[PDB]
Structures are given as structure tokens and as C-alpha cells.
Amino acid sequence: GISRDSKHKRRATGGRMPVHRKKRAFEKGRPISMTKLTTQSTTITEKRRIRPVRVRGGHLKFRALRLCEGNFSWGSENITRKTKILDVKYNATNNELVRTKTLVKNSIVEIDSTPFREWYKLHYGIDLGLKKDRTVLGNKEKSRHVQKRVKRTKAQALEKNIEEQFVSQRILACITSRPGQSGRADGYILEGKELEFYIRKLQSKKK
Template sequence: MVYNASNNELVRTQTLVKSAIVQVDAAPFKQWYLTHYGVDICRKKKAPAAKKESAEGKELEFYVKKLQRKKGKGAAA
């Protein structure tokens, strides 16, 4: 137990009551989950680099075309 708003004595004696804040070590559960399911639950999945680059490329293309249209309108006027 980490904190109890009602009484610090309850923290010292580790008496569990309603609204107490408890800190739990997740390492044993993560290890069991990894061995049982073969999935590491604490890792984030990375997006494929090719998809990310293509999205950035499309966005860049859009802005380049937009600038070209503005230049074309300015030259014609």
C-alpha cells in the first residue's frame, strides 16, 4: 500500500481499506503472459516505414501542387 487519505497508520500496518492507493508490480504477470501467449504486452508496435514515407510523400506532393497553382495564378494576372 502506498497511500491512504484517511489514516497514515493504515499505511504503516498495511491494512487494506476502501479508497486506499495500492502499487502492484506487473513484472510477474508480464512474464506469465509472455510465456503463455508468446506476446510481449509492454512493447508498442511500430508502423511499417514504407507506409509512413508514402503518407509523407503524398502530403508533400499536395503542398507542392498547391504552391505551383498559386504561382501559376500570380504569373497569369
């Protein structure tokens, strides 16, 4: 009965505070649920594991214990595909969560560019594989291929950081979902303000 009643505290004026009530059941406090990753099945066969907990109203709440694949969205483009997350880096909350590759709502991680690479290719005619072969278009320029241009000319100035990411195969993104609460793990792809920044934490972190 790990409770959370604010009684076992000390009122403003730090004087101990009285109790007449045994711990009451609605102050429930469930066992924490650290969330790891299977981006290393060196031991861990069963890729992802999610256990459902019977919550109050009568509903179920799925709890993420072990995972390997989540869903992520590229802010800029409005694209979202399910991908395989790689390694967790910098958890902010604490560095131990990174050491155990645990999944906090706001844990910054890596993903496979594959789905985004695949897409950025189909909609713009730009693979993002090593720079030289850059574009891959059609043979004749009379029909609908005229659009991959129109979009491509949209000065798709995807930050020098977004570019490097793709080619390296790794992609930076933060999460936005309580695994211990919904069982999933969804995140947005890192960019501008935070990208530049979180990276800094990483550059200086190792150096």
C-alpha cells in the first residue's frame, strides 16, 4: 500500500501532523515501472512487453516495461511513421535512466531514418543518402514530375543538422508519452531550438 496521502508530511511550520485514518484505498500508489529497450536483444529475446493494470473507474491502463519500437513525428513536414528507436541519450531527469536506457516521457533518443528517408524521397525526389547522388528524378520532364521540382525548390533548407542526421542513419527525437501509463512510446523529431541545445549537452557531455 505505497500511499501518497499528504498526511505523512509536516505542515508549513514543519510540526509533525496527526493521523486517525488508516491508509485508505483510494490513495493507491502503484509500483514504479522502469522502461528499457530491446535495441540489444543480447539476452532479451521477447522484444516488447506491456502489462495492463486494472485502474480505478474500471478501465485498464497498459504499462510499458520493455520496448523496441515507437512512433515519431517530424515537426516540420507533418509526417509520422512507426520506427525502431535506437539508444537513449541524456534523460535530463537523471543520467541513470540513460545508463539503463529507461524510457521517461521526456527522454531524448535516436531512431531509424528509413521511414522518413523513404518518404522524403517519394515526395521531393531527394534520398538524403551520401550527398553526391543527391537527387533521383524521372527521365522525361513534361508530366507530374514537375511537382517534385516545385516542392524541392521550396528551398527545403532542412537545417545543416537535420541533413547530417539522415545520412548517419541515426535521428534525434524526444518522447511525449508515459510508458508506465499508456504502454506506448511516442516522440517528436528534434529540431531548431532544442536540437541545437540538446546536442550541445551531448557534445560537451562526452568531450
